[PDB]
Amino acid sequence: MSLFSAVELAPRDPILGLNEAFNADTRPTKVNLGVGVYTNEDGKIPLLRAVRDAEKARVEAGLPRGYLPIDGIAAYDASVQKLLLGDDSPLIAAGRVVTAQALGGTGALKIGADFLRTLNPKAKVAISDPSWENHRALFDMAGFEVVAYPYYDAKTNGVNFDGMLAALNGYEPGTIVVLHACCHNPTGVDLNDAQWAQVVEVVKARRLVPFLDIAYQGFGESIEADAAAVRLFAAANLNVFVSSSFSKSFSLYGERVGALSIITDSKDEAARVLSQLKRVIRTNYSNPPTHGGAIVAAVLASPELRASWVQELGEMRDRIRAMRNGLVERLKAAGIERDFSFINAQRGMFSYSGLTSAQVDRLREEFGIYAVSTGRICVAALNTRNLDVVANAIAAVLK
Amino acid sequence: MSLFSAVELAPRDPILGLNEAFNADTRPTKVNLGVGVYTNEDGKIPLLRAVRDAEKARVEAGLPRGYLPIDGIAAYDASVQKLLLGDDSPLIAAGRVVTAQALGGTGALKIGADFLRTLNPKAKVAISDPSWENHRALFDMAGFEVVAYPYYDAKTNGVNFDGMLAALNGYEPGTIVVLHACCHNPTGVDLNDAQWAQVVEVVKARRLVPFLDIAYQGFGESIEADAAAVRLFAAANLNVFVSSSFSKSFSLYGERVGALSIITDSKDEAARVLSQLKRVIRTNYSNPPTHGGAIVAAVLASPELRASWVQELGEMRDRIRAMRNGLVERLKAAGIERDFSFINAQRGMFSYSGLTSAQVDRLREEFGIYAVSTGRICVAALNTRNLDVVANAIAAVLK
């Protein structure tokens, strides 16, 4: 009968079990492919040059640290909109886009979810099959029933687009559809620009609410190309929600730098929407933190710093591609039955390897190489120092 | 039929209107007593020497920015507990205290509220009459009905403590009672230590859930004394929620550094409670920002920095005291018959001046002194350069 006596232990994230086993493994050569960050060859997170440079310049200014506005640093908010929509967006010019700084991509999703709940608390939320675990968890906690649209096709290592479109073609008006812009998490399987056009047409025709989640702008093809899906929705004169993150693109995970952007029909509608979004932020955490956002805003505003960022993010994009192709080449040379060509078609930090749970267990026990029970691997955790070890271990497990 | 067509324009924050008026006043002797932050003799928000040093050390170290644990930097959480409960707390030793890094005091209130809603969604929340405006808004948005206990007594400039106790004695088991630990915001009227003892007794007897809000530890009497209310609840073996903030005490408003602490009955219960708190954090913003928390942790861990902080916090405490007494002295010298003793009895950044709305209007129009319509003034906005203009204006409006 005490206040907490009925409190249960929360469900364990299945990652915790993987990390526990990895950590207890006394072999000095072990590889964790279950992570969700981009690492360097020492298994550590890089500090980007543009970030280091910006921080060094800013700390010398010794600035006071009063509160930011509820919706964050205005210049940051403006730079985010241009990064997403393009410098010459007519929506920006018409004052139709609302952007609030947020606590990463996660925070943006939350503030969007909470605002959406006030608009129509009977709407359902549709996510990809499968999706980044916190999509379902976040929207369910925000009060929504969550359903999944067909997406990943294990038989083809691609997208079951027919199943996706058929699902969308059955959703009721107001259903919130959570769409990865690119670099699908956790599978790496992405839609092409033509499949995106069909998605936009159905969302429009059925009055669905698209909620784009763009956490990897720059990891797919290019900074500009990776925004394509967001811009297609923008061009369609839809109300669109966009959660964006700089956690990965700036290697700034732990500073919690993202944004929620909403496309509205008018300046007046933008003002009303922002006014309500401010309430939802203020009663959660008042106003956002300064450091991360200030640094991203500084990098984006400086031609030199921005060019350094573009270059480095491109090197990260390209290293992932080199690892993807190196794994494919090696598994081919190894004489494996399974064709791993799909690894080059998948994009971003992850791939669904297609290893069975049994094969993943063998890979761990026999070789100290840790993949997720789903077959997920973080290709961003491969480097020239472990690539051959990993490829040879896979070749061994696959017979 | 459009998605946002029913969205209303939220009511605008009245303080913005006051600030904009203040900024549109051309009189260079104007003073804004409607603010909510500490400023120094020079009228600036201070960057504390200890923070300057910790920040410089952090940035120049060139450190990467991986994700923090969901519950933040463990060393920071540990330092918070000892700051609140004392180094030799037997509850800390027994593993009974849960502490999660939070997005300021506000964020701590939010995570606590969301957790409480899962425990018992029918509980009501009782706040002081009056209270920091975001108390009512935050708990309402989190799904609670909010009531107010009698507290500030306009006729005595003190506390209606009989009314307060009568209210608590009428509340049902499970009622969450939000209690300012010291430096009451917005009145500056605090409970004495005999009063606190009775509040603990009633909370215990009536099975109420105390939620302490300690945003000004160090601004009342001392760092240790200011935690007395918290320690009294801890000593009574009650399950107590504590939102603590470093926004004011470290002058780190814009970095969002605070914490939620919860006293539980056992190490096992602490594990189950923490796990649930993690779930509430993860589905909100995933994990907290690093920069401000790293700075606080460093200050508290570095003897030389901690000592600098103690000194400088004491100087802020002492400057407010100097402003309160300097105001009282000048009003007496100006020949005001009213007893302003209460300005010296009241503690922290705010006082209710007792001016009527119409007297506040005249202070603005005639003298360019901007007070809130409630008569609230920020005594930390006074300094030696504006004390006479403020005292002379107040005297003019009071015969």
Close Cβ partners of B44 (under 8 Å, ≥ 6 residues apart): A64
Distance CA A234, CA A212 (A): 11
Instruction: Look up tokens 């608009």; give the residue.
Output: A119
Query: Residue B223, Cβ neighbours under 10 Å: how many?
Result: 17
Please, is A366 exposed, middle or buried when counting C-beta atoms within 10 Å of its C-beta (0-12, 13-18, 19+)? Answer: exposed
Report the residue of chain A nearest B58, measured CA to CA.
A59
A118: left (phi over 0), alpha (psi -120 to 50) or beta: alpha
Question: Which residues of chain A are within 8 Å of residue B56 when distances are taken between CB atoms?
Answer: 59
Query: Residue B373, Cβ neighbours under 10 Å: how many?
Result: 14
Cis link prior to B210 (omega < 30° from 0)?
no
The closest alpha carbon to A177, from A221, A214, A213, A130, belongs to: A213
Residue contact A279–B59, C-beta within 8 A: no
Residue contact B64–A44, C-beta within 8 A: yes
Question: Which residues of chain B are within 8 Å of residue A48 when distances are taken between CB atoms?
Answer: none
For domain B1-61+303-399, the question of CATH label 1.10.260.40 is answered with no
AA identity, residue A290: T
Question: Which residues of chain B are within 8 Å of residue A272 when distances are taken between CB atoms?
Answer: 4, 7-10
Best A286, A316, A378 member to test B by mutation, with max B CBs in 10 Å, is A286
Report the residue of chain B nearest A289, measured CA to CA.
B255
Instruction: Choose, from A132, A196, A226, A309, the residue flagged as catalytic.
Output: A132
Best B56, B237, B286, B299 member to test A by mutation, with max A CBs in 10 Å, is B286
Distance CA B331, CA B325 (A): 10
- Indicate the resolution in Å: 1.8
- A-facing residues of B in 25-64 (CB < 8 A) are 37, 44-47, 51-52, 55-56, 59-60, 62-64
Beta strands in B129-206 (DSSP E): 146-149, 152-153, 158-159, 176-180
Query: Residue A214, Cβ neighbours under 10 Å: how many?
Result: 26
Distance CA A65, CA A62 (A): 9
Considering only CB atoms, B279 lies closest to which of A10, A46, A47, namely A10
Residue contact A283–B56, C-beta within 8 A: no
Q: Tell whether B16 lies on the interface with A, counting CB pairs under 8 A.
A: no
Report the residue of chain B nearest A108, measured CA to CA.
B285
Residue contact A282–B137, C-beta within 8 A: yes
Question: What order do you get walking across the sheet with B209-214 strand by strand?
Answer: B97-103, B257-263, B241-245, B209-214, B176-180, B125-128, B146-149
- Method used experimentally: X-ray
The closest alpha carbon to A240, from A215, A259, A212, belongs to: A212
The closest alpha carbon to A32, from A24, A40, A43, belongs to: A43
AA identity, residue A252: L
Question: Which residues of chain B are within 8 Å of residue A11 when distances are taken between CB atoms?
Answer: 279
**3-state class of B25 per DSSP?**
coil
Instruction: Choose, from B132, B196, B226, B309, the residue flagged as catalytic.
Output: B132
Instruction: Choose, from B77, B114, B213, B226, the residue flagged as catalytic.
Output: B213
Q: Tell whether B66 lies on the interface with A, counting CB pairs under 8 A.
A: yes
Distance CA B75, CA B64 (A): 18
Report the residue of chain B nearest A251, measured CA to CA.
B65
Distance CA A213, CA A209 (A): 13
Residue contact A2–B265, C-beta within 8 A: yes
Question: Which residues of chain B are within 8 Å of residue A59 when distances are taken between CB atoms?
Answer: 55-56, 59-60
Class of domain B62-302: alpha beta
Q: Which residue stretches of B158-302 are H helix?
A: 161-169, 193-205, 223-226, 228-235, 267-282, 291-301
- Structural domain spans, chain A: 1-61+303-399, 62-302
Distance CA B57, CA B392 (A): 46
The closest alpha carbon to B210, from B143, B275, B149, B276, belongs to: B149
- Secondary structure of chain A: what % helix, strand, coil (to 5)? 45, 15, 40
Are B93 and B105 in contact, with CB atoms under 8 Å apart? Answer: no
Distance CA B149, CA B177 (A): 9
